[PDB]
Design a protein around this ligand. Sequence first.
Ligand SMILES: Cc1cc(/C=C/C#N)cc(C)c1Nc1nc(Nc2ccc3scnc3c2)c2nc[nH]c2n1
Lengths: 416, 556
Amino acid sequence: IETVPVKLKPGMDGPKVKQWPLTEEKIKALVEICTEMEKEGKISKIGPENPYNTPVFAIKKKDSTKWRKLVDFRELNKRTQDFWEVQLGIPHPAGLKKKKSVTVLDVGDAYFSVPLDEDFRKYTAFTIPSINNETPGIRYQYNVLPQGWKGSPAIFQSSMTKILEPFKKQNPDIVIYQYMDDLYVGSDLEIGQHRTKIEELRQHLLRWGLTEPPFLWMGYELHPDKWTVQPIVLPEKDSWTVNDIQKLVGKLNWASQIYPGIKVRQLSKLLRGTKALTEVIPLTEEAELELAENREILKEPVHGVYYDPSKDLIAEIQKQGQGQWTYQIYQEPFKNLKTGKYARMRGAHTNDVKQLTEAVQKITTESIVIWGKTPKFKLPIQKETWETWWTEYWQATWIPEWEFVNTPPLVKLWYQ
Amino acid sequence: MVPISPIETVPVKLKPGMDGPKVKQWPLTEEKIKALVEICTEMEKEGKISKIGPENPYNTPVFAIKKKDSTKWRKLVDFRELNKRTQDFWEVQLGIPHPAGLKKNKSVTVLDVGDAYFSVPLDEDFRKYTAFTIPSINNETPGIRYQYNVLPQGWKGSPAIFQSSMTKILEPFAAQNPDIVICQYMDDLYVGSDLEIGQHRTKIEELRQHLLRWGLTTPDKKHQKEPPFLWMGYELHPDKWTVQPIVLPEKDSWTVNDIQKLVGKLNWASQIYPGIKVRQLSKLLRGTKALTEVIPLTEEAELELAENREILKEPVHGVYYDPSKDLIAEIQKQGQGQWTYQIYQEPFKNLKTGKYARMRGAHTNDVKQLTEAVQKITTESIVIWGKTPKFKLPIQKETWETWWTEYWQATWIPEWEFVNTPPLVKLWYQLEKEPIVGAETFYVDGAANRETKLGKAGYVTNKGRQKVVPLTNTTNQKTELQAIYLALQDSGLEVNIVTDSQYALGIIQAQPDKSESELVNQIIEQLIKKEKVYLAWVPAHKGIGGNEQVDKLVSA
Ligand SMILES: Cc1cc(/C=C/C#N)cc(C)c1Nc1nc(Nc2ccc3scnc3c2)c2nc[nH]c2n1
C-alpha cells in the first residue's frame, strides 16, 4: 500500500523520447487498452507541464491474438538509478542454463498491484499518437509499477520472494529467475508434469491476486541442455583444389587470431606456384599432418575465456542464406562466450527482417538465461530498414540495444 | 448568473534551481507611457492583469509600438528572459497534419477564439514571475506595478497550455460527435462535417452552446473566409488541396541565398507537383557557406530548372483520403540518385507526391536506393494514413528475388508489384559462387610507397600471362584496385581473380553500380561486360604462390 522511494541518477534529467509513427490498428488497440488501464487507476492523464516522453507501441504475443502494450523504457532504464538499497544484486543463478526444461512466464501483470512513488510518476510519461496528428496525442502517466521498467522487478522483489516461498520450499530442485516481466522456471523433469509444475505455479499468482490476468496463461518452452554451442571445423576431403586450399588457409589464418598454435606453412607450400583455381593438389605428408594438428587445436576450448559482469555483452549476427543465421556473443574480440546457428526461422521464409527479428529475440532470451543480462547487437541491416519494421515482428516484453553494420564482413564465410 | 465551469489551472514551475527574471525597465518617452497606462487600465478592467506591491522583485521590460498607419500604440512585453527560466512543456504542435491525410468535408465552419484565450488563467503561484513596471512620468513617482492573471502573449507556456485547455474542453463534444472534425490555428477554431448544411449549423449551434458552459463566446458575426483556406503553406478546398502557389523567379544573377529559396520552394512543391527535381541545384550549394555568393549555373542546372518551370506552368491538385479505397505508391528512377514518387488511390488523382535523394556515400546501387526510398515512403504513409501503401516499382520480381537472396544484409520491402515504366532497375553484374573451370586464373596485387607516392599494380596467371604497371601519386588502396582493373581489362569473358585486398573485396561485396572513385567505376564497367567473374580472397604475406609471386613483383 506504500510506495518505494525512487530517483534518477545524479545530473541526469528524465527521458524525453520522440514517439514514432504508429499504424491505425496499433492505435486502436492502445486506446482501448489505456481506457481500461486509466479506468483501473494504473495510469492517469497528464498535462503540458510534463516535458517527458517514452515511446509506446503494441505487439501480439507469441501464439496469442491479444494486443499487448509495450513501453520502450530503454531510456528511462539507463537514467533510472541502480537498485541496491536492500539487496546488493542477485548473484545470477548459474544453474538455470543447465535444465532439461526452462519455461518463461509473463508475470508482468502482477506489477500493477503496487503503486509507484508519486514523485517519480512524471518520468513515465507516454503518448498514444494520432494518425496524421489530427487530434492531439493522448498523454498518460503511470501510477503503479510499469511493465518494462527496470524498477518494477526490483521493487516488487520483496513481494515476489514471498509468493514463491510455498512452491519454492515445496520444490527445492527448481531454479527460478526473474528478468523484467519474465519469470524463468527451470525443472529437470518430463515435459508433461512440467505442464503440471508450471501449472501449479500459476496458482499462486491467481491465489495471491485474489487478495483476470492477461498473459499469465502463457508458457515459453526452452532447453538450455540441448542448447547447441559451436566449434570451428575444417573440411575433410579426398581431393583438394587450389581454391579449397586457399579457403582453408584463409579460415586457418583467421582461427589463429583466436587459437595459438595454428600453423599454415606446410599448407601454403602446396599453393606455391601460379595454379589454376579448380586444379587438384594432392596433399603432402607434411601438410596432412599440419592440418591434423590444427584440427586437434580447434577441438579444445579457448584459453582465458571469462565472463565479467562489469562489462557489456556483444552479439554479432551474420546472414548465411536460406533461412540460416549465425551469431556470436563476446566481450573481448576473439573470446566468444557463446556461438550459435539458427536454421529454419518460423513463418518468414520470404522475409529477411522477420527472421532477423526472431533471431535477435532468441539470442536475447538465451543471454538472459546464461548471464541475466541482454547483449548489445550488431545487426547486418541498414538502420533505416530495421527501424521501419522490427516492431511488426517483436513478441518479447523487453528490448535490447543495437547498432548497425554496413561493411560486409569476410568473417561470414569462416562461420559457414 | 448562469454558473460557469472554471478552466482548470495548469501547475507551472520554474526550471530546477533557477530563479525568475529581474530585468531593467527601459526608460520610456512620456508619449509611450501615457499610451501604456491606458492599455493596461482597460486590460486590468478585463481581469487580465492586477496591480502588485513593491514586494514582488521580478521584472520583465515592457514596450510601446505604434502600429503602422494607425495613431494607436500597442503594448509589447519582452518575456524572452522569463522564457529562458520557465520549464519545458509537452508541446503538441510538433506535428502539423498533412492535407493528403484529411477526408473531404462538405461544410467547414470557422469560429473565432481570441476571447476564449483569455478565459485561460495562469497558475496562481507563477503569476508573480510575470511582473512588469510601467515607468512614471518623469520618474517622479514609483512606476505602477502589474502582474498577469492569464497566459501572456509571447510566453513559453501560453501556446502549450492554451492548446491543451481547449482540447480538454472540446473532448466530450468531439467524442459524442464522431461526424465532426475540429482544428486549432491562430486565434481560430475550424469545424467541418460531412452533413447537409442544415444538420451542420445545428451542430455548430450545439458547440457554441457547449463552449458557453465555460463562459466562452465564439462570435456568430463570423469571417469573410471562403475557399481556398491559406493554412501552413497550403490551399485547402472542400474537395482538394495544393501548395500555396509556387512561382519560380526569373534571374540573370543567381546567388547562394537565391538558389536556396529556390530549392525550398521546389522541395515544398515537390509534395504535389510530380517529377520535381533538385540535385544539380543543391549541388551548387555544396560547401559554399556565403549567403551572398553568386554561384554560376551549370548547363545541367539550367535544364533541370527549365524542366521545373514547365512542371510549374500550371496548377495541380491532390485529393483527400478516402479510407474505403486502397493506397498506392509509385516510384520512378530519375538518375543522379534521384527518385520521384506519387501516392494515389485512383489513377491520376494523386493525394501527394514526392522525391527521394540518394544518401551521401562513396559507393551505391539502384536496388539499395529504391529500398531506402520505399522505406521513406513507408514511414511517411504510416504517419499520414496509418497504413502502408501498396507499391508499384520499376524492378522485376526476379531481380529483387536474386538481390535479397544473395545480399549480405537483411532486407525487405512491403507488398508490391512490378511496373514496366523505364528506366527499369536491374542488377548489372553477378559474381560467381564457385571458381570457374577453364577460366584463366589471375593472381593480382598492388603496393605503393607511402612517401614517394609511387607504387605498382599487376597480375600473373596460370597461363603465364603477366603484367606490372608503375604508378605515380597513388596509395596502397588505389594500387590494389588498379590491379584488379588490369585483370578484368586483360582477360576473356570468364575469369577467376585472386586478391589479398580486404579493402577491395569489401567494395565489390557491397555490389555497387556507381562510385565516386572513377577507379571503382571502371571496375564496375568491366564487371558488366563479363560473362562470369569469380573473386576470391587470400590472406597476404602467407606465401601463397601465385599471390607471393606477384607481391614480390609489385613491391620492387
Ligand atoms: C477541420 C480542419 C480545418 C483546417 C483548416 C485550417 C485553416 N485555415 C485544417 C485541418 C487540419 C482540419 N482538420 C481536419 N480536416 C479534415 N478534412 C477537411 C477537408 C476539407 C477542408 S477545407 C478546410 N478545412 C478542411 C478539412 C479531416 N478529415 C478527417 N479528419 C480531419 N481533420
